[PDB]
Amino acid sequence: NAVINRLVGNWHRRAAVKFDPGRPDFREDMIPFRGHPIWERLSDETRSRLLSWGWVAYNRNTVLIEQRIANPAFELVIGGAYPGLGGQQLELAVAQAMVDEQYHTLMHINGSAVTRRMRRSDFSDRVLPDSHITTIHQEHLDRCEEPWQRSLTTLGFATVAEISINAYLDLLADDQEIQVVNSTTVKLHNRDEYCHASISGEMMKQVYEALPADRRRFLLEKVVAGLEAFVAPDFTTWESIVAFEGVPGWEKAAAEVREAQGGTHLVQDHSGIHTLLTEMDVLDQVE
Amino acid sequence: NAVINRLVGNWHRRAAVKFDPGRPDFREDMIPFRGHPIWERLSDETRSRLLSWGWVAYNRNTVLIEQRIANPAFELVIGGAYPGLGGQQLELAVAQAMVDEQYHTLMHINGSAVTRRMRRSDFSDRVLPDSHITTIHQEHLDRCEEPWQRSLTTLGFATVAEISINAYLDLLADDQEIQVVNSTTVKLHNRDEYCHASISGEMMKQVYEALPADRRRFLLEKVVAGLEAFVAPDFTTWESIVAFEGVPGWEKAAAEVREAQGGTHLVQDHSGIHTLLTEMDVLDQVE
Ligand SMILES: [Fe+3]
Ligand SMILES: [Fe+3]
Ligand SMILES: [Fe+3]
Ligand SMILES: [Fe+3]
């Protein structure tokens, strides 16, 4: 595989691992309450802190994906959990990506740290629950009866993550209004993930081909569930944020927001997975 | 904590993450069979492959420590598993160390990859069992009844690892006979671990102080068990190596080697932990 081989070759060359209070820390249009009348009841100070929390939550989701889904899948790959993989080159490519992911986690932790320092406020990760994708991944894991099912669940969710993260990062990478340290952090992350998507795509194709029919089917079901979870707005995390901020009538509004917005995707660009499933000739079966 | 703070400050500056067939790939004196009469029954080719396997095994032990012990402890630290820690600076220091460890894992995987390429042989990690420290860590975990016990077990083993790894790396870092890519890989790793030892020491001191008396005691017992395991020769891994190479009479000799050498430490420099336990004024109680 020449894709794998060259990524391995030039990693040392491309890998990323080598303030204006006026600017919002985040995009208003990615806050669920921004689309509800309650937004007008809020003070400029509260609006500002909700933007800060938004950024913090976006960082937390990214860290949680890397630590609970992506890296655990990479480790299972290296440990031989899946048929159709193996060989020294893949091991090196994956070992490199694990470094990248850990560095991405650091970048996002620092993104939040800078916000906390500059705004002079805690915005603690401890306030936030498990992100929506983390939750759904864990629910699927808990329904597994066999080890092979858990490992395929994680692969499916990680494939979705690695192939769709570019579109999640795109949401802030291009935004010229928000804090530039925030956009630049997201852009830099975005660079690495282009190459990760290629690796993850290749690996998925090969595992799928080498799996028996029952296990193939189980894997695609996990890919489906993962994408659904990945692209959704995290209503639950935002509910934790607005409760902690003491927004009056947050609960009633939250119910109304789930009703009105339960159907919109935060991430609308699904071209990564669409294209992967097309190249695999399995797009036939989907939700 | 100024130690923590400056390590955080200058990480971007110090972090490492930014062939002669004639030369042995490893040190003969770290092969258990080197000290037994069977060594004279072996061909130069077999002696050479055992040196290669030695290096490969040493890389595998290092990877297994990073992936099963060190990074899992760092993640528990960040997730608030232990009293007496917390705060943004520690989180950044630890997030940085996790990048380092993952990079060390890559360096050691590449160390083995180069050996496999240049010697034109598989020396597969799949032949090697769990390393001795990995085994003992896992045995202690399996005896735990409560979550808090598992997290303290991992902390204790990780503290030992982070504070003692310099002495394990020293064994090859200075060796001017072995392959220079091998020595240089180990030296480069060694650079980072000086700073890791400081972090890990600080964290241990503070957790211990904040723990109740029963939990303090449990933690030190785990430190003790960890050091014992960490410094021992891995007789079991070497047994897998010599069996796979088809050394005649390996089994009888292996028994004799455990008898004669069961008492020697591969790692004789225990100054890291000795000094930590002295500064904590708990050296009183030991094995
Ligand atoms: Fe990433
Ligand atoms: Fe990635
Ligand atoms: Fe290390
Ligand atoms: Fe370390």
Range list of H helices, chain B: 2-14, 38-41, 44-65, 71-78, 88-119, 132-143, 147-173, 180-210, 213-231, 235-244, 250-261, 271-279
Distance from Cα A108 to the centre of ligand 1, integer Å: 10
Q: Residues of A within the annotated binding site for Fe cation?
A: 66, 101, 104, 162, 189, 193, 196
Neighboring chain A residues of B117 at a CB cutoff of 8 Å: 88
What residue ranges define each of the domains in chain B, with the CATH number in brackets? 1-287 (1.10.620.20)
Minimal Cβ distance to B92: which of A18, A99, A113: A113
Give residue A131's identity as a one-letter amino acid code: S
* Sign of the four-CA dihedral B19, B23, B25, B27: negative
Identify whether the C-beta of residue A152 lies closer than 8 Å to the C-beta of residue A218: yes
Q: How far apart are CA B129 and CA B114, in angstroms?
A: 21
Q: Note whether B102 contacts A102, CB cutoff 8 Å.
A: yes
Q: How far apart are CA B56 and CA B52, in angstroms?
A: 6
Q: How far apart are CA B155 and CA B219, in angstroms?
A: 8
Read off the DSSP letter of residue B31: S
Identify whether the C-beta of residue A181 lies closer than 8 Å to the C-beta of residue A111: yes
What is the maximal distance between C-alpha atoms in chain A? 59
Looking up tokens 């021992």 gives B232
For residue B122, the number of C-alpha atoms closer than 13 Å in the C-beta half-sphere is 10
Taking Cα atoms as reference points, which of A182, A268, A237 lies closest to residue A57? Answer: A237
Burial grade of B284 (CB within 10 A; 0-12, 13-18, 19 or more): exposed
- Please report, for residues A101, A232, A234, the alpha-carbon distance to residue A265 in angstroms, rounded to integers and kept in the order given: 25, 5, 10
Report the structure determination method.
X-ray
Taking Cα atoms as reference points, which of A7, A192, A161, A183 lies closest to residue A90? Answer: A7
* Sign of the four-CA dihedral A85, A88, A91, A97: negative
Backbone angles phi, psi at A25, to 5 degrees: -80, -10
Give residue B141's identity as a one-letter amino acid code: L
Contacts of A147 (CB under 8 A, 6+ apart): none
Minimal Cβ distance to A106: which of B18, B99, B116: B99
Q: How far apart are CA A174 and CA A214, in angstroms?
A: 42
Which residues does residue A264 pair with via DSSP β-bridges, in sequence order? A262
Neighboring chain B residues of A66 at a CB cutoff of 8 Å: none
Long-range contacts of A259-266 (CB under 8 A, 24+ apart): A260/A35, A260/A36, A261/A32, A261/A35, A261/A233, A261/A235, A262/A235, A264/A233, A265/A231, A265/A232, A265/A233, A266/A30, A266/A171, A266/A231, A266/A232, A266/A233, A266/A234
Burial grade of A278 (CB within 10 A; 0-12, 13-18, 19 or more): exposed
Cα dihedral B81, B84, B90, B96 in deg (nearest 10): -40
A87: tokens are 């060989």
Question: What is the 3-state secondary structure of chain A?
Answer: CHHHHHHHHHHHHHCCCCCCCCCCCCCHHHCHHHHCCHHHHCCHHHHHHHHHHHHHHHHHHHHHHHHHHHHHHHHHHHCCCCCCCCCHHHHHHHHHHHHHHHHHHHHHHHHHHHHHHHHCCCCCHHHCCCCHHHHHHHHHHHHCCCHHHHHHHHHHHHHHHHHHHHHHHHHHHCCCCCCHHHHHHHHHHHHHHHHHHHHHHHHHHHHHHHCCHHHHHHHHHHHHHHHHHHHCCCHHHHHHHHHHCCCCCHHHHHHHHHHHHECECCCCCCHHHHHHHHHCCCCCCCC
Distance from CA of B110 to the nearest CA of A (A): 7
Taking Cα atoms as reference points, which of A231, A229, A228, A236 lies closest to residue A254? Answer: A236
Identify whether the C-beta of residue B17 lies closer than 8 Å to the C-beta of residue B103: yes
